[PDB]
Amino acid sequence: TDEMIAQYTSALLAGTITSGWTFGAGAALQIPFAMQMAYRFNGIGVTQNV
């Protein structure tokens, strides 16, 4: 149903913002969203300090 489909997407979004990318790999870990973004910048190639 559209209801639990939107619920699945909500779970995806919540895990992405809060738990980082780990929930699809291991167990969800609380971790700051800003630090998650800094880690992603480190991923692309720019140092997180920016």
Partner: protein, 33 residues
Amino acid sequence: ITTDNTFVSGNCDVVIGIVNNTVYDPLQPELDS
């Protein structure tokens, strides 16, 4: 927390959520001699 794991950048203003702390210099005992 040694300087080997850190790179200083900017100052203590732009950062948000920073905390005060000490960072060990791995040279001080080696600087004493």
